[PDB]
Ligand binder design. Structure first.
Ligand SMILES: Nc1ncnc2c1ncn2[C@@H]1O[C@H](COP(=O)(O)OP(=O)(O)NP(=O)(O)O)[C@@H](O)[C@H]1O
Ligand SMILES: [Mg+2]
Lengths: 488, 492, 266, 124, 133
């Protein structure tokens, strides 16, 4: 909201600038990267629009100068670190697409040169807030490793290792040609939902939380985020062609490739043919996710604890994502922690039921496919999952006012590009007035928080039952995009 | 090896093997073999079948040997193997698998799963395996007790007669106690003793529990509640040696009874920990009762009790209620016993605070009869004065929780009128009560739509803010909290 | 091996003895005590780290011995003073002196208690978490419940007057409740109580455990399955061997070595 | 304070005598907190659990009406076995027998088919 | 039924217990089992009522073969009430509710051709109304 047009004795912009300056000076480690990203919105083309953008850039530059006046060393060194990060992101690295061993970082990159930045806390870490202004004994960046790994994708992000003051490595994912501000905002909402869950006894006793990771956008088209070490994509564990769980445990069933091909063939056909093909595929494709906890945790007590944690994580994530209208929950967008068996949701670009606007609309509130339920045990959705879903929905309903206020603050953020556009819709599904929309989304969220679904008021249990029935309905799953992999 | 091991495991359930040590040895053999990789390339599920085992019988034996997690894992393995075998043969939910297992090996999978989940003690998992014996009265009563549906449990216990008399009477007594009904419970126990001469130990324990909870001091191996009653009676009689002896015996008995269990689930420890904490609190109060009693010692004892209650904020109500009841009995004994120094007012205030805390705790756990009983106990020792007290506000809150809005509003309005007539910005203690009463009355009137917004804002909310702030009784923490709450209500 | 065998043989001789002591029994007892003292002195003099593994059992055996006739009491106090007081400056023995169980509150134990408490508190004052950690660390040494009795009392004091720090402890254990220190302490106390069953002076140990468990009531531990303390050294030793037969050999050798300190001669 | 008669109490008694159910809510402001009025409201609304709890709790109520209300609340909730055991304990605890309790005992005896229980009243 | 109408739940349970005292479970179900399911529904115990009604429907389907005129009304009412309860609780998708319960109740009521009755006419009207709704 920073600007320059209405500065004055009682102007909004001057008061906002003073408040933001005070916040930045009291807590530089929580605000410097944000303000620099605002100031470095168009740094990408520099290294290699509207009046609002220029006003925001000028105000951010003013805040940077004011911060630098009292503490110049940290500002200069953080600027150098951000420049090195953006330069590393802009690296093409198209030749090493086939290599998975670790590519040595070129000596030209400035990230290799910089060592011992005592004034820079690691951006990936979560910095605890102390009310006393002094910050001390914080883990600062010491150096970076000389090797970077390549992650699969259309545009290849880079996995780097940062060695901090304590000498312990932390893996970071550097991305370019993509916007990370949406992910950071969604992480903020996830943190607020976790705080709401913590302060209620019913959900605190069950330890219901949403797994979160730190995202730091460095420009309008680049960023660095926390790499969730010890996690594997659920699709990688399940339907990997070489040593996937489906291939290992059910050799005589359909291969994942066969199911995918059969699903694509029926795409341009009638709905009845889609449903019958989906049923035939599900007949020859049985879930095997229950073997995830069995093969990793041989001790029965640890196995039971990990399975319970997995089920609780699935329930909490499903309810929270339904409240926020999270979409694009395909197998590569969900990771599972190998140590704790808890689910982490990534790629949060699609939310607030924008996925229903897609060419092939998403007909499910969340992902509750056969493998997800099979991972819950012999009882399935009954028992822990349904009760935890009811508890999470009860907490959500009890905090509808605060949640609605937070989403109101989100939706009117000028820099939050949450609405669906044709280019984004086409990129999501490829094959070989704003105020009106915001008000509609807010009213839909209000209806969800009050338990109104189809014009009828439902209890927490009834709403949970309706959501589970919609999520597990084969008719809805048969209509989904093949990339969603509803049969997995 | 497969046929002989299967024969051994079926011998355990024939009911022949009846020695727990041999069953544990063979279960250890199975557990070790489960973790080894077979020479042929395969998965962990294949590694689970070094021998052609029937894992349902092994799971039943493990449950008999109190290996609940192992039994659950073996039941899951058996279900998976049965499904795979059925699919291979053809080239079914839990109920169908249970029917087939019952007609093949004689063990119902659903019943075994329900027993395993009951043994584990995880509350939500009890809803997963429900389809079996839903209509059976025992399962219904267990569900009612788990959900604290004490009225439904009492009705079902009274109705069903095929249940054995001992457990039926135990459930009736528990349901009566959990709903208050102390006089009804005492008369029921008297009638039961009239109708039967034979006395079973569990009914004796329940009778002793009712005797000490209701302060019936003429009711007089030793059990826990008998030991508690004897210790309380000795404390009243100032018999301290036998008091300490009985407390020590009860402590040793509790620990010994805990030692003979499986020690596999954390939920098995909580009742023992609650009993031991109650015994420790009684023992601590014993020393204070022995020597002279002063304001400072009572204050420190109550502060320690409040700290331990804060440590127990996440515990279940079933583990906190006995401690609160024992604290109430201890305080009432302390007040009732010889006090000629006129400093029984300190115990009166301490007991009032304790009963307000108990009412708040019972309200938090959706219980309404216990707060009413606590309010009655408060009114027994207290009266209505010009300077109102916090227990009247607590009573109004209790009546609100009972879905009796008119009564709570009337009580709060009378409280506000009395405070306005009495207080003139002179009593710092009355300030917080006045502000909270005004704020709560305004919030309730807003919620019920019984008053227009203008009157609610003029008379209650801004008035609460003005009382909290313009009185200028600053330099306090509770005042800061009350000011924050009033500001938030007015802002909302 | 000879050192360990001699100490364990003498300890077994001392532990089992007639309640009524005659002249020949007293002479045999004095001979055992004298031989134990001579062996301890020689081993300490010529090998500083010789007694780092057998000090705990020797002290635990000698402690009940002072509640007896004066003649044997003189020898037992002389041996205890030589082991503890006379070798406080010894660097290889100072580590193991810190970890032994506290001596009972008695006038005869005044000097030994003072020395041991200073050796324990030389670094500084102890917090509740530090006290619990020390109590748990002492456990792994000797499987004799009665020897721990005094330590139990000490714990019951701290948990009585450091309840404010218990809130901070539970808060610190919230993120990872599987290895919460309080549930670990409860499980260790219950294991100790199980060990005390069918042993001399079991009621006192049970009462101490009951008081300790009454100090920490039914606090929500946020965990379902009880985990037992497992030896990390054993696990690391197992990681070394890849062959199944080598792991079997290691397990059998560990069992055989652990059985060598048993009273039975066969 | 002038004539010694409370208008609100008189109105409440008149409306109770008339027996019109809704009119009982018109004059409520008087003696809302009094246990007798609360119990009458609970009985009028068939809140038998609340009536039973309040009857058990309050002791200043005379014993005869307290026991009558307890028996009525127990009967209206079923609880035939509990009611019978309560009556047995009550007879054990007291030798004097008032006519209303005798009528209630006869009602419980005929309703529960207790045929060994044996001016005459209706239930007798 | 009368006690349920007056918002009383303990008396219907006692009456159901008294019924079960003298009666048992047979292949040809009776109306008191449906009444017990209704009582459990009035107790806000929806899972128990649904389980009882589904067991009733399965037993009726296994036993009846359009042969017993008395069982026809019970079968139709059980199917209609189960469909309505499943619709109210949102525990089943509309397609299964319509295929298995509502149209099935209409088919049982009408295609069986056990006409010339008044209770049959009332049951047919209720099933038609439920399907229409
Ligand atoms: N925060 C993270 N922690 C761990 N692994 C991650 C994380 N984010 C992404 N990955 C991995 O990197 C892969 C690439 O995913 P992503 O970063 O979303 O790029 P993408 O697949 O192209 N989706 P997008 O870039 O938004 O079009 C994922 O499939 C994961 O295996
Ligand atoms: Mg992706």
């Amino acid at each position: 909201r920073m600007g320059t047009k209405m500065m004055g004795g009682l102007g909004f912009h001057e008061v906002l600038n003073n408040l933001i300056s005070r916040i930045s000076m009291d807590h530089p480690h929580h605000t410097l990267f944000i303000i620099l990203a605002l100031a470095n919105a168009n740094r990408d083309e520099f290294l290699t629009s509207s009046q609002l953008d220029e006003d925001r850039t000028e105000a951010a530059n003013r805040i940077i100068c004011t911060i630098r006046s009292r503490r110049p060393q940290m500002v200069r060194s953080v600027e150098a670190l951000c420049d090195a990060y953006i330069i590393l992101a802009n690296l093409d690295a198209t030749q090493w697409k086939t290599q998975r061993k670790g590519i040595n970082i070129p000596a030209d990159q400035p990230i290799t040169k910089l060592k011992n930045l005592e004034d820079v806390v690691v951006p990936t870490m979560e910095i605890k807030v102390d009310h006393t202004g002094e910050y001390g004994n914080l883990v600062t960046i010491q150096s970076f490793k000389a090797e970077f790994r390549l992650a699969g994708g259309v545009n290849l992000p880079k996995i780097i290792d940062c060695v901090g003051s304590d000498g312990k490595e932390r893996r970071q994912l550097v991305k370019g040609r993509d916007d990370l501000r949406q992910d950071a905002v969604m992480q903020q909402v996830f943190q607020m939902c976790n705080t709401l869950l913590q302060r209620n006894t019913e959900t605190r006793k069950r330890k219901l939380t949403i797994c979160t990771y730190k995202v730091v956008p460095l420009s309008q088209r680049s960023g660095v985020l926390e790499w969730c070490t010890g996690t594997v994509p659920i699709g990688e564990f399940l339907v990997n062609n070489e040593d996937g769980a489906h291939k290992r445990y059910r050799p005589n069933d359909f291969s994942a490739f066969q199911c995918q091909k059969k699903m694509m063939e029926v795409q341009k056909k009638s709905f009845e043919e889609k449903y019958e093909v989906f049923m035939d595929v599900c007949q020859n494709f049985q879930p095997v996710f229950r073997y995830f906890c069995m093969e990793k945790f041989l001790d029965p007590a640890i196995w039971f604890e990990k399975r319970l944690a997995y089920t609780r994580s699935v329930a909490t994530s499903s309810i929270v994502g339904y409240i926020l209208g999270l979409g694009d929950r395909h197998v590569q967008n969900i990771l599972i922690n190998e140590q704790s068996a808890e689910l982490v949701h990534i790629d949060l670009g699609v939310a607030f039921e924008q996925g229903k606007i897609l060419p092939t609309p998403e007909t499910v509130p969340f992902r509750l496919t056969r493998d997800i339920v099979d991972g819950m045990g012999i009882t399935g959705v009954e028992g822990v999952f349904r009760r935890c879903c009811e508890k999470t929905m009860e907490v959500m309903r009890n905090s509808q006012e605060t949640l609605l206020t937070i989403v109101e603050v989100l939706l009117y953020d000028p820099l939050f590009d949450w609405t669906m556009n044709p280019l984004k819709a086409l990129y999501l599904q490829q094959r070989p007035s704003f105020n009106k929309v915001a008000e509609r989304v807010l009213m839909r969220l209000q209806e969800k928080l009050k338990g109104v679904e189809e014009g009828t008021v439902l209890s927490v249990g009834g709403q949970v039952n309706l959501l589970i029935q919609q999520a597990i309905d084969p008719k809805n799953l048969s209509r989904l995009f093949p990339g969603w992999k509803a049969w997995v | 090896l497969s046929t002989h091991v299967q024969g051994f495991f079926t011998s355990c359930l024939r009911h022949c093997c009846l020695d727990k040590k041999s069953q544990r040895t063979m279960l250890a053999v199975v557990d070790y073999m489960r973790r080894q990789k077979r020479p042929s390339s395969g998965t962990i599920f294949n590694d689970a079948f070094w021998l052609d085992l029937n894992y349902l019988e092994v799971a039943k034996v493990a449950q008999s040997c109190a290996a609940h997690f192992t039994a659950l894992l073996y039941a899951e393995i058996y279900a998976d193997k049965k499904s795979m075998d059925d699919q291979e043969k053809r080239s079914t939910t839990i109920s169908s698998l249970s029917e087939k297992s019952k007609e093949e090996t004689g063990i119902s999978l659903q019943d075994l799963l329900l027993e395993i989940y009951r043994s584990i003690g995880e509350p939500d998992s009890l809803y997963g395996c429900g389809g079996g014996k839903m209509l059976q009265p025992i399962t219904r009563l267990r569900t009612y007790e788990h959900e604290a549906m004490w009225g439904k449990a009492l009705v079902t216990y009274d109705l069903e007669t095929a249940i054995p008399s001992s457990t039926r009477q135990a459930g009736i007594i528990q349901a009566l106690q959990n709903l208050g009904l102390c006089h009804i419970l005492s008369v029921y126990l008297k009638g039961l003793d009239y109708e039967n001469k034979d006395w079973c130990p569990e009914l004796e324990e329940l009778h002793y529990q009712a005797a000490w909870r209701n302060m019936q001091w003429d009711h007089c191996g030793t059990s826990y509640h008998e030991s508690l009653y004897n210790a309380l009676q000795s404390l009243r009689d100032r018999e301290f040696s036998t008091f300490y002896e009985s407390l020590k015996y009860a402590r040793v008995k509790e620990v010994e009874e805990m030692c003979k269990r499986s020690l596999e689930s954390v939920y098995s420890l909580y009742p023992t920990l609650s009993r031991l904490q109650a015994i420790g609190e009684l023992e601590s109060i014993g020393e204070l009762f022995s020597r002279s009693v002063t304001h400072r010692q009572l204050s420190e004892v109550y502060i320690k009790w409040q700290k331990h209650s804060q440590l127990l904020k996440d515990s279940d109500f079933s583990f906190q209620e006995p401690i609160m009841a024992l604290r109430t009995v201890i305080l009432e004994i302390l007040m009732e016993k010889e006090m000629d120094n006129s400093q029984r007012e300190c115990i009166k205030d301490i007991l009032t605070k304790h009963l307000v805390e108990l009412s708040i705790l019972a309200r938090t756990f959706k219980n309404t009869q216990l707060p009413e009983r606590a309010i009655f106990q408060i009114k027994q020792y207290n009266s209505v004065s010009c300077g109102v007290s916090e227990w009247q506000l607590e009573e109004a809150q209790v009546f609100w929780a009972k879905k009796e809005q008119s009564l709570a509003l009337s009580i709060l309005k009378q409280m506000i009128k009395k405070l306005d007539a009495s207080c003139a910005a002179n009593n710092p203690s009355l300030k917080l009560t006045y502000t909270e009463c005004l704020r709560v009355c305004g919030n309730w009137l807003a919620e019920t739509c019984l008053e227009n917004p203008a009157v609610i804002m003029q008379t209650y909310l801004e008035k609460a803010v003005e009382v909290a702030g313009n009185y200028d009784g600053e330099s306090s923490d509770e005042l800061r909290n009350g000011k924050m709450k009033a500001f938030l209500s007015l802002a909302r | 091996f000879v050192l360990r065998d001699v100490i364990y043989t003498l300890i077994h001789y001392i532990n089992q003895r007639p309640s009524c002591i005659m002249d020949v029994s007293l002479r045999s007892f004095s001979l055992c005590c004298d031989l134990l003292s001579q062996v301890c002195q020689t081993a300490v003099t010529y090998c500083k780290d010789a007694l780092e593994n057998h000090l705990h059992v020797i002290v635990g055996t000698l402690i009940p011995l002072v509640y007896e006739q004066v003649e044997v009491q003189k020898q037992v106090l002389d041996l205890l003073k030589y082991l503890v007081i006379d070798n406080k400056d010894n660097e290889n023995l100072y580590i193991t002196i810190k970890l032994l169980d506290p001596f009972p509150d008695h006038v005869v134990f005044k000097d030994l208690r003072i020395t041991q408490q200073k050796i324990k508190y030389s670094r500084g004052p102890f917090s509740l978490l530090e006290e619990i950690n020390h109590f748990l660390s002492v456990s792994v040494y000797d499987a004799l419940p009665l020897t721990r009795l005094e330590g139990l009392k000490d714990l019951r004091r701290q948990l009585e007057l450091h309840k404010d720090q218990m809130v901070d402890i539970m808060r610190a254990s919230q993120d990872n409740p599987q290895d919460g220190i309080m549930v670990k302490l409860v499980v260790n106390l219950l294991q100790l109580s199980k060990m005390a069953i069918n042993h001399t002076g079991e009621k006192e140990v049970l009462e101490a455990v009951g008081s300790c468990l009454g100090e920490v009531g039914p606090i929500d531990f946020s965990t379902i399955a009880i985990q037992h303390s497992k030896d990390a050294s054993y696990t690391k030793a197992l990681k070394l061997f890849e062959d199944k037969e080598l792991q079997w050999t290691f397990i059998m050798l560990t069992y055989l070595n652990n059985t060598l300190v048993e009273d039975c001669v066969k």
